[PDB]
Amino acid sequence: CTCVPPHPQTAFCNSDLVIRAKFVGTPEVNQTTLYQRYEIKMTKMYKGFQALGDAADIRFVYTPAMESVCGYFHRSHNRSEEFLIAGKLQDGLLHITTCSFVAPWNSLSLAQRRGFTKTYTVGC
Template sequence: MKMESAKLCAFLAASFLLLTLLMDPTAACMCAQQTALEAYCNTPFFIRAQFLDATEIEERFERIYDIQVTKVVKGPRELKKYKRLYTASQSNLCGYIHPVPFTTDEYLIAVKKHPNGLSTSLCGFNVRWDHLSKADKLGFRKHFDSECRSLGYP
């Protein structure tokens, strides 16, 4: 009985060690790829905005971007009043890391409401507006609402 128990413990320890070695420790955040339509259907709010500045709150692992919302693409108009965008401060925590230096480029940003503003993540659909295809721009402007309904999204 002791021998079987020792073999079981050795097997479990070896299995744990093997799994630990095979896992990528930097892969804490895993995101599913989405098309523009899927992102639109699965996200409550979309805005177009410019990034102005960023502040990192290290003790909360949080980054706060100062933004200027230029257009509410999906959601209530009141989203235009928000000036802050919250995210985790590290990409392995699914935080969105905006490229610097900040420019006047507009970004299409998938957002959720946050107690002090809006929030986004690395897994959100966050794309420079001028990098979208003409078809996707048209979809965000006019067609995606009806396409989502026809696909059964609320």
């Protein structure tokens, strides 16, 4: 998988859900469809919430099981860390890839953290 990492701006307009959430545990894998899901404890939604189509859960984020085909592999020691999930809504499930904007909330700059609050919506 090769990705051009998205600038928070353009990822906001492209994604259907730009939520804030925490990853609960190890990924659950379905070795017949080659997909993988992470159980997420959702905290706050910035887009969502409008809901077009859809859509839902949300306490599972879905991604391919294999890293080579853009499966997102979570790199986090601490389990209580908050992450900005910016993903697409396929069917009724939130989907994500290596190329999706996923970053810990605290690591974001002031402009970025203010961006998801109500700034990037203007840029769309």
